[PDB]
Symmetry: D2
């Protein structure tokens, strides 16, 4: 059977709580072996090898776990047939996107999580992990970029996002849809992201021990500009705006950001709106402010890309081209 490596980072899939009929739980109560031994069917589909990379709740995911993860996938790619990275649901969409642009290993790279902790009744973790391996083991998964497999669905790392705070069906690719659906151990892939991923990108965190500082500001009515200023005073390399509607900023936040952009800070306009592209050629003249419109990339994902882009360039027109290709 395929040799599949399971890089365990923690999350709800490893979390347990008081009971099955109680929602309480804490992340990372089990290790990579227990997860695997708990799903002995894995043994009929892949020759599994587990490794605990970290054991955090993804709310605490950070650049170091990211660098570490990419370096690890790239370094052991040549050694295994595919990967499964067990992770919490909270920031999984951010990590999947980050690996999607820094992982040069085009062998199946699947991320999997669980909305219910391992202790719950009808826990989703087992079958999720089982299905995740079904995907990391399918040859047709190679070259699709880094994937997220949840709820019998194979989702591309760039478009996948967490849609609902508790639903087991929460992961969906909200703008462009899923790449495929799994049924009875089989996947019918009918799509692949056209954006450039993995080996077709220039991002190389192999020698990177740290990613550039990129923060996120929220826009809403009567939005304060303290947050944006706080990030600017601390010298952030970039700031992404979780803007209102089609990428718009509260006037005072727009002020701080325009000052920022004109004095060096990379500034990306994204939106707090869940679906749709933050387009240019709407109300904002990005060209005039040196702002970059983020496309279908939501705030946290636009931060992933800006950080990597900032590793190569500081120019708004350059970053924009990157946001237009990746």
């Amino acid at each position: 059977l395929p040799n599949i490596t399971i890089l365990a980072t923690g999350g709800t899939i490893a979390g347990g709580g008081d009971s099955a009929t109680k929602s309480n739980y804490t992340v990372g109560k089990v290790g990579v072996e227990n997860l695997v031994n708990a799903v002995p069917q894995l043994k009929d589909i892949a020759n599994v090898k587990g490794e605990q990379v970290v054991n955090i709740g993804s709310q605490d995911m950070n650049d170091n776990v990211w660098l570490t993860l990419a370096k690890k996938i790239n370094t052991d790619c040549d050694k295994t047939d595919g990967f499964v990275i067990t992770h919490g649901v909270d920031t999984m969409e951010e990590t999947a996107y980050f690996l999607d642009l820094t992982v040069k290993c085009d062998k199946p790279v699947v991320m999997v999580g669980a909305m219910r902790p391992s202790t719950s009744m009808s826990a989703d973790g087992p079958f999720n992990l089982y299905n995740a391996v079904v995907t990391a083991a399918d040859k047709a998964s190679a070259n699709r970029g880094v994937l997220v497999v949840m709820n019998d669905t194979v989702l591309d790392g760039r478009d996948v996002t967490k849609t609902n705070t508790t639903d087991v069906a929460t992961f969906k690719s909200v703008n462009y849809g899923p790449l495929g659906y799994i049924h009875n151990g089989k996947i019918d892939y009918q799509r692949t992201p056209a954006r450039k991923h993995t080996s077709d990108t220039p991002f190389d965190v192999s020698k990177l021990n740290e990613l550039p500082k990129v923060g996120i500001v929220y826009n809403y009515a009567n939005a304060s500009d303290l947050p944006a200023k706080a990030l600017v005073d601390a010298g952030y390399d970039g700031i992404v705006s979780a803007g209102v509607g089609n990428g718009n900023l509260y006037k005072s936040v727009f002020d701080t950001l325009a000052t920022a952009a004109k004095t060096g800070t990379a500034v990306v306009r994204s939106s707090r709106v869940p679906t749709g592209a933050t387009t240019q050629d709407a109300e904002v003249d990005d060209a005039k402010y040196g702002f970059v419109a983020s496309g279908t990339l939501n705030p946290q994902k636009a931060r992933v890309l800006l950080q990597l882009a900032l590793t190569q360039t500081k120019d708004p027109q350059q970053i924009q081209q990157i946001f237009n290709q990746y």
Copy 2:
């Protein structure tokens, strides 16, 4: 025909562009009489009295337009049979939630906007105004709280949210659905919000010239606690966190807010996630920290209720009671 007061605030609906086939536009280029003079069919269903309250794009909505609108409607309630607020789409969902709680008139109060400026080919403002007037003039709409009428659909101001950055069908009550749908100038109503609104709320802004300071901090991987710390230094009365997953906070952010709470800063846990409730009984001990769980209230809606909750109390336990009633 019934008397409907149209309180104009600006927005795309009252905005234009140099082209009908180009996406660029500037808001607030149109006057209420012009918006109203453009939809002469209005005269066949209502005796319309337009008054331009302000002219801004809703990205610039602030507490004063809220105070103004709240009071204006409250004062003029007996002088008219309903209201229609022409508002930008960016923050229409926050303004509707604020009016929903501060307005004491149970006559149909309907908000309306446009995703396409007045100039665009197939501009949606026209029929949206017709339909919003159809709604404010339907006696069945009374007592349903502040409504948002968009795309032939009547939505409650609490649950209604902008779902897509550009789609005309963007406004959706993502958790509980719409109250009704408009076909041929008639509305089939099959739902009404159960959370207490309008006359049933304890919020009286009639004497208020200002609302408490409530900022929103965003959560993502490697999140900077700078924004949160800036909000606490500025003396913010409350901080709504747009957390990850089910209201979870990044380590540093959590720490800053957990401390802010210990010193009286009301802290609400919301979610960057689009649908679902940031529940209590998951991974955060709201009780140990003095945090309130926002429920289905997204960051920006949670901020509306917090400011108002903050007009009534500072006690997290009571604020939490507020977040469960309204």
Copy 3:
């Protein structure tokens, strides 16, 4: 603890497959006791009594089980504090509606299924059933009509429909939304169906042993009139048309029906389209044809309402009014 009656009809929830990782299966493999006894946590929230009414797959569901369930729930309303009906997922939305119009018991009546067989990994039935009891046991679930509890969501029996062929989250009230969400054994209800249900309807099946014959014919390009002709030829009482777009019929189908209507057959124009209403005032002159527009009711739900109206009247306009209130 509430005394809850579990009337089991069979379906996937009490079905089984040879494997936890194979999608294959057969319905009606488990009895009610085995079923109930497999979620021993049930006895901690309720005093469950189970009764097998039938043990079929809902694909073969039919008039007699509907009448049997209806009589049984009505006869027994007095002995218990609420009901849970385990049912297959295929036609659960039809029975839910049927019982929503014929059950005069206003104590909680909850339907439940499982998309995965009891034998599968991360099988959904157990928590589904647990949550179905948490609902039938909530006093707040009373007077909401018949409900369907699936995926942590309470959905009114009228609007709820099977949205996906295999997704555990398939069940959704597509037009108006869920009534409430279940988190940690508690339900935050924010809605209730506005149409007349249960004790507010004039349908009494208590003395009925059969229900008027109502068939559904599908419309599509190059639609055959043969199926509609067969229904008319067999002397059907009502024919629901699953039309194209806004209730439209293909010419030879529109023909058989305009005539059938002319000769005393009730004809409801519904739609193959999954959401939205088949309205009056589009392209078809219901008046001229004596056609009843189904409203937001999908073909099969329209069948449920037409059979029951057909027990009261044969008059197109009386029927249309029934379609406008139930």
Copy 4:
């Protein structure tokens, strides 16, 4: 500018109604010339040549218009740069899919319709047509198969379906997402159907004057088997089943289909469930019966593929492999 040929078939796009605020209307009240002239900006992006193929409501679409339509794009492929087919929205997803399997012209073939009649307020027709021409004129649209452009979204003819009976944003590719989004005249493609279309299909209707006889039967509780027998007695070559749940059939329907299959009749199992695949390896042993699982092809789309499969083979297995490829 590109030479785009507009072939008209009628539909709401060319339908007028007595009022711009009355939902009432009739299709086929405008001609291609008028349609084209109505949106004169078309002239700024293409050299439009209108050709009125037919003038009907798509609820009346048939094999003949489909054969003619395929034959016309095929023959005139060399004389133009792209094709935009105006069409009624009712059976649009059907024609879109017919042409997707029979058209060998890989130059942009784009279908467009409108939900609001031309005479209406905020008519969608104008900009839909404009955007459809943008699409047909973008060389990026070549090779994606036949497209459907509605509500600023480029959708593939295979997965596209009418989701709401009245919403202008009703067209969605429910299972795999849209190919791209149009903003300010530019399309951001991020996907293309992986299933085989146009020239990669062995379907050729160039010499065909009639398609095989395939009808659809509906399944619901107590489903009559009359409609299925009607089609059988009439010698239908194929029977698509709009089944309950995962392609399941009401007992008596099952029997008629099973027996008809045994006598050569091709029986394809689809589902009335709007999204998801009708799979094999569930409750029905397709092989044992000579039935074909339709996959994600809804009943009407599966009727398209079956008629075509039926022009090549009559063998269940060959027909099944066709359903796994096209």
